[PDB]
Amino acid sequence: NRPNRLIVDEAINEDNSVVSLSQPKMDELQLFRGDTVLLKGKKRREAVCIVLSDDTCSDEKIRMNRVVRNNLRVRLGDVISIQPCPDVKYGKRIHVLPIDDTVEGITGNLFEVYLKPYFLEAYRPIRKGDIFLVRGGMRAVEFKVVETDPSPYCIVAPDTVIHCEGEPIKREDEEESLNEVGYDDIGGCRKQLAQIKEMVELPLRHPALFKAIGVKPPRGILLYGPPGTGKTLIARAVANETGAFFFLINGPEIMSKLAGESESNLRKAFEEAEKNAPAIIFIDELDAIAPKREKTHGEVERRIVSQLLTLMDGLKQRAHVIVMAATNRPNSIDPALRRFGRFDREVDIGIPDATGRLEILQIHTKNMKLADDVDLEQVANETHGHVGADLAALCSEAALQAIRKKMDLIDLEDETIDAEVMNSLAVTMDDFRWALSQSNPSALRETVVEVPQVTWEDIGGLEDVKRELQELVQYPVEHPDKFLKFGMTPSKGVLFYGPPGCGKTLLAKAIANECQANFISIKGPELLTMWFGESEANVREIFDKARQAAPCVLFFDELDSIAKARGGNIGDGGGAADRVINQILTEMDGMSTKKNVFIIGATNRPDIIDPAILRPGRLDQLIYIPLPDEKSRVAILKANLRKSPVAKDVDLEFLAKMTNGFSGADLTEICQRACKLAIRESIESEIRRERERQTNPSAMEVEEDDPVPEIRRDHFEEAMRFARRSVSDNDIRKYEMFAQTL
Amino acid sequence: FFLINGPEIMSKLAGESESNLRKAFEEAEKNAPAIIFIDELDAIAPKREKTHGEVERRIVSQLLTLMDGLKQRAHVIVMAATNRPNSIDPALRRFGRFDREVDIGIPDATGRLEILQIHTKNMKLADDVDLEQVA
Incomplete structure (x- = not known):
């Protein structure tokens, strides 16, 4: 049919x-x-x-009826086209x-009342499976047989009311049992x-395709990756929408122990489906x-794996x-x-x-009134890295906590819990956010969903660095033909100068996060001074890691430290x-030439690391x-002082100009030492004031948040005098000239 | 609630004491709001x-x-x-x-001060003990 979908509005008839x-x-x-337009359903x-x-x-081009839409579960604006349907029986x-x-809960003989309206004015033709309006239960009747030995299609007379099995349906048939939070x-x-739907369809509805392809021994879909989440319970609402087949219900499997019988029944089910058309019933537990x-480590687990x-390797694609x-x-x-x-596909x-968080929020809002002005965007942003079962569970818990707090604050709600009071006391977006912050997702951290040790703005400047990273990202994706006709991609490896902790x-982590990449942040003496012998051992380990995690940017920083000068x-x-x-020379002369292995080394001198x-x-x-x-x-010292307690007069430019020879972390050590000295002075002053107060009730007090609530510029200068400048001016000029001349 | 003593099913019987405990729990829960005196x-x-343990695995499954199939009603x-x-x-x-653990x-x-208050309420030990300093 058409590739662009639409939505169907209400029926033209009133x-x-x-x-x-x-x-x-x-x-x-x-x-x-005696027949009308037969509506197809899921x-x-x-x-x-029969109308x-x-x-x-009059040829009224009205849309489907509300009752018809609810019964057929027809999607809004679905392409109504007649195609080959090979799954219809008679x-x-x-x-x-x-x-x-309807039988239970009705006073007296409910069969007599049901048959009274069944013969006449029943709103149901002469067929089996007709649903009737009932009072009580507040649930729908839509059951799917996982594997029924008999067929579901047969005509039935309306004059004969056949007795049922006597088992009431407590479960909400319209909903799905699994994927409660994993939505x-x-x-x-x-x-x-x-992919799952295609595998379920083609292997079960297009066996000719498999026969021509010749993949009979192929089992089907046994996925991995999303383990332990609500994706574990992702069977329903995906297979429930896909439905289930008939015949070959199951084996007996009733001994409650099944020592080897568990393996026997499993093998029987695996062999039985290879020549049958049973449904893929998800294995419980x-x-x-x-x-x-x-x-x-005995026999049960290995036997399970072998089975x-x-x-x-023993089931057909059916x-x-x-x-x-x-x-x-x-x-x-x-x-x-x-x-x-x-074994060959992921x-x-x-x-x-x-997106998952927003979908879960939409599902929850459809299920219950969260708030009048619930900020679902705020909820999705607060749980962007955590989406799925964890996000939905956290949102439900937060909403429940906020609603409970609102109900408790509104009144005691111990005599007449008003439904209007509860619905109006909806889980406020702020209250829901606070409860979610008090709660937690399933994951140990919601920020662990991305590879980012530092922000792109956290790395100050890096203008040409970001330029090179963006060029590497683009020319390999933008103009790869330009590189191909130009030859090979550029070699990697940077040589930083100055102190360590250069950033x-x-x-690299900032770029990788901006590139949504997991850069292989390599250590220093961990590639060249390899612990398994020569540098080739760690080089091959990094090569395997980068090949299994491409692109893993092997950030082999600190080449001077990487060499470690073993001797x-x-x-x-x-x-x-x-x-x-x-x-080391061989690795630098041929290694894993993929995954962007860039080694931004430290260049203490022209021959300190690999001359x-x-x-x-x-x-x-x-x-x-x-x-x-x-x-x-x-700037880093300013951020740290903001995180601490230094204020008022701060001659930061006047002091930072004295030692401008920094590599980001070089001057941060002096700032940390000054902060520690100031904190020690504040603690000592607090102790002295407390001692004075103990000696006399009105003797002393606390001057401020710190003995030096401003920048401990005196303490900072004292620490600087006790320490020494990073490098001399002549040495700095010589290093700059050497870098420029290269 | 019912105390968690593993020796119940562990007897000359068939281990049915676990089923009896479940039935008694159901009867009490129907009778009134009951709890599970879960041990460590x-x-x-x-x-x-x-x-695994034959009776052990059976009791674990039970x-x-x-x-799981608790009295949701x-x-x-x-x-x-x-x-x-x-x-x-x-x-x-x-x-x-288990629903939520x-x-x-x-x-x-602060809990130390509370426990000290409890102990002092048990008996007036001293009139000069600094409970805050001790805590």
């Missing part, structure tokens, strides 16, 4: 019960008097109402079971849900029944009843992915973003040192990402 | 981490079934516990068996 059949229904199709649902229509009188005689809920815009991931090499491998995401424990999942079915899982790791040319130690140096790479020998282009020069030490 | 997490189960408030998290079995630690409290100087 009366909802007047659902006039369209002229096209009787024109394109031979719509007789999970193999179909309903047609006489006059196409020659029958001869059926038993029209009455509603069990996002498309159920977590649109791509993953689409899938991790519990199948330890999957996670529970015990999972056999089932994934049912694929495999738990996804959290199938087994995340640490040791079942071998259903290790065997056929997920799951397109959507990350927890503000190279911080700037020791005596006996076998000299051999080890020479091997380490040669391995050959410092010369244009190893690096064809020693691309040092220049940063804009700022008094970032002054 | 170790007393219940390590979640079959050390061993407990999980009672906790009766709203039987089964009081959970918080011992060492390692002692906590995962099923109750998972939502569905919370942390374990800790003491402080």
